[PDB]
Structure formats: structure tokens, C-alpha cells
Amino acid sequence: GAMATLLEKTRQVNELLQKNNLFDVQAELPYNKMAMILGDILESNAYIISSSGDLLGYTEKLDVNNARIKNMFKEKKFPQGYTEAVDMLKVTEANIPIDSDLTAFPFESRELYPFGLTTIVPLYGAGKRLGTIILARVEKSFNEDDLVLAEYSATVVGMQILYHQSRTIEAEVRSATAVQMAINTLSYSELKAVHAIFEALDGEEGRLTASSIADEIGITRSVIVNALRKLESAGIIESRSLGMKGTYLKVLNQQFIKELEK
Amino acid sequence: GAMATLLEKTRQVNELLQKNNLFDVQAELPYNKMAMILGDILESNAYIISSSGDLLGYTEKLDVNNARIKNMFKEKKFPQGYTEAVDMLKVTEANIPIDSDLTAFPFESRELYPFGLTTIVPLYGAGKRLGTIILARVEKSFNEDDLVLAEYSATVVGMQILYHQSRTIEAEVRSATAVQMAINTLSYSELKAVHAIFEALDGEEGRLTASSIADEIGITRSVIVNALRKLESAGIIESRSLGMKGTYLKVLNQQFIKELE
């Protein structure tokens, strides 16, 4: 039955994607396996795009009988602006024809697959946009059965993404709060000093002559140094004394500069 | 339109639960609103059980006719071990009759609800058991349309639970790193000052006089104030100066005192 068929597919999705962790560390794309499962169950080509527009994984059915080794290693790339455009879609769009710029088919293929259809499914979970799932079928349309399964699949993918994010979050906030406290522990004296330090110390890593720079900024010569010992003891940079040459520094938290240029 | 009906319901679930954050902080149960939405769309009473067997939220349809304003305040309680038992179910079990011990209906109602049916839906996401959703209907059976919707609903709830877990780790590590690094910026002097500052406060808010603290503990004021502007710049207390009268402070990180003691 249509409903029994749909149900069994949702069960297959559950067994394969809800009851397993599918983040492939060291894969070409971390979610290629997840995309493959989705494309199989949904009988589609499938692409998983992060909330920032990065392709996280995809599956395209290979034409085995006509395969050519030269063509098999080509990386799928979406046209300039496609990932930003899909992000503007806030609800599912189904059966997008190939003449739309939202088609998942390369634009060269518009002639080859005039009836190719694309369905774009925003991934929302817990109020957040988590990315987007894109499905493409050369021949069949997406019916209402397919849309339910697609929406079901998006939530399962959303959970995988939310779970992967959770494993990172502890180390992320530890570093952000550290940057924030180090920024707070600064005066105008040391801060505009720090600003110029990263300016001269271009590349994030390089040598520095704190004394010389002091003149460049019109800041007291002890004040310049106070920012240094604060940041390094706070744990954001590394230093070794070069003697007359100066002191050589190393940026250890790269999100710092983003917070200071804000 | 059986399929169109299901799709519209999944979309209502999306609009209401996928596109909103639904953790009711400082509420009775954080997921009471989530349970109500689910019970509405699934035409059931609904219970949300955490991975550890704690009831996180539920909704039961009130009968206006027999309402007693005092009986409306009773906390829902399951037979001991029921919430732990449901965790041993690893796949959905639907249309559980009232004669089973896994029924969601209290047994007192078992006489009044001959056809009461219970459906238990494990919440799995990303390989983890995230809890369980329990659905109860007076009579109508859970057909395949309902199970699809129910399974759909379970993933959506799972996302909420997972999202809350990450925001709980985020706020904990934010508070620990803030407290601990603030301690590291304190000398023997500044520590002994802050200690008595919190003793003087005695609780999360209060008034204190910087001069007096120096006199009471024998540390020059500069040290006392150096610690204050340190704690306030670190973002652990809020302050407004009353001048000669003194200074008013507010504890913003309550796990600080535990770490200092």
C-alpha cells in the first residue's frame, strides 16, 4: 500500500541514518554516505549543503555502461551563487523545472534532460536553518509520497548535523570566551596597541620589534608591552625572545582578529 | 487526499516545532508546549520521556464537565519503573491495549477506557537514544498514516532535545572557562579580597563599602578595587557606585563561589 510503502521507507531511513552516526571523518565529503542512502531510498540524485553553502556530500547515479575513467574523478561544483540562492528558499520547493536557475542539473544539460526535476528541501531543526537537501530526478516527478519522505529525511539529516555540531561546541565556546575575556582585560592603552600589533605582524605569524612600533603608534613604551604579556599569559599568542632582533610571536587563536576588527 | 493530509500535518509539525525553539526555561516541564502541539496534530495525549526515564513534558485533554480546580493541579505520575521500562523498547510499538502494563492510561481509567490505545515511539538520532514519545488515544487505532506522522514527530522532538543539549554544554563551558580564568588573574592579595567581598555580600546581591573591606581584612584599597574592576571586566558581577554610601554589586555567575571555596 502507498502508506505502508512510505512507512517502510521511513523505517529504512531510521535504521540506516537515525540509528547510526554517519559523519565520515576523513571522507572526501563527510556526508557522502548519507547522501547515497538518501538517493537510494528517495530514488534521486541527492546533495547535502551546509548552512554556510558548503557542499557536504552528494550522490549522482553513474552511467556504468558508458563509464570513462577520465570523467569519473570530476568534483561536482555548483554555479557561482547557487548555494546562496537556495539559502533564500525558506520552504520546500518541489518539481523545479530545468529552465530555472534553481535546477540542480548543470545548465549545459538543460537540453539533454528537458523534463529533469529538482526538489529543494531546507533543513530546519530547533528553530535553526541547518543546511539544505537537494534532490534531482531525470524522469519521475516528485509526488506527495516523495515529499513526505523527503521532509522526513531532512529531519534525520538535521539531527546528524546537530549531533556533529554538538561534538565541536565545547571546544568552540571555550576559545570564544577566552578571547572575550582577554579583550575585556585591556585598556585603550594596550588595545589600540594590540590592534597595531596584528597590523604589523601581518600573516598572523612573523617577527616583531615592539620598541620600534611604539613610536609608530604614539603609545607609551611600557604600555605596548603590557598588552603582550597579557595576551600571552592569557594564552592567545606564543613568544620567544630574539634578543636585539626583537620578539617573535605566534597567533594561537585565529578567531581573535575577527572579534577585534568588529 | 490521504497523502496530502499527512503532508500538511508534517508541514504543521515543521512550522510549529522545526522552525521554533521550544524549550520553556523555568517552566514546569520544558517540553509541555511541544507535547501539546504533538497531541493536537496526532489527536492523542502525549508524553515526552528523556533518555534517562524522566518525564519531560506531557499534555492530557481536560474534561470540562468533571473538572475540579484542585484536581487540575495534580502532577502526572507513572507507575514506578514504567519510564525506565519503555527505554527497553527499541522500535515503535503501536496500538498497545489497556491490558498491557506498557499502557499509558492509568489503570484506574482502565475500566472507563476499554479501547484506550497506547503507542510508544523511541527517539533515535545520530545513533543515540534521545528519549521516548508516548501517545494515547481513547479509542481510534493508530493506522499507518499516524505512525508515519508519529515517527516524523519523534525526529523533530529529537532535534529539539539534541539542540538543547548543545546549548546546555555551551552555557556550562562558558561559565566554567569564565570563572576559572578569572581566578587565574587573581594574586594572593586579590583572592583574599574577593573571598571577603563574597563573604561581605553573603548571597548573590548586596551592598558593601570598599574602604571598610580594606579595614576589615588588612589589604590596601587598591588591591580591593583592582579585583573589583577585574571581576566586572571579566563579567562576573555588575556594579553601581553610591559614593560615600558604598557600592552595590550583583553576582552574575553563581558557580564562581563553589570554585573559590
Residue numbers in the entry:
A (entry chain B): -1 to 260
B (entry chain A): -1 to 259
From the paper:
Unexpectedly however, the structures revealed a previously undescribed monomeric form of SaCodY and a dimeric EfCodY. The GAF domains of the ligand-free EfCodY protomers pack with close to perfect 2-fold symmetry. However, this symmetry breaks down in the C-terminal part of the linker helices as well as the DBD domains, which all assume different orientations in the four protomers in the asymmetric unit. Furthermore, for protomer chain C, parts of the linker helix and the DBD domain could not be modelled (residues 181–260). In ligand-free EfCodY, residues Leu60-Gln78/Glu55-Ser73 (EfCodY/SaCodY sequence numbering = shift –5) form an extended loop with a few loop residues involved in crystal contacts. The most apparent difference of the loop structure to that in SaCodY is the absence of helix H3. Nevertheless, Lys74 (Arg69 in SaCodY) extends into the vacant Leu binding pocket.
In Gram-positive pathogens such as Staphylococcus aureus (Sa) and Enterococcus faecalis (Ef), the pleiotropic transcription factor CodY plays a key role in integrating metabolism and virulence factor expression. CodY DNA-binding is activated by two types of ligands: branched chain amino acids (BCAAs, i.e. isoleucine, leucine, and valine) and, in most cases, guanosine triphosphate, GTP.
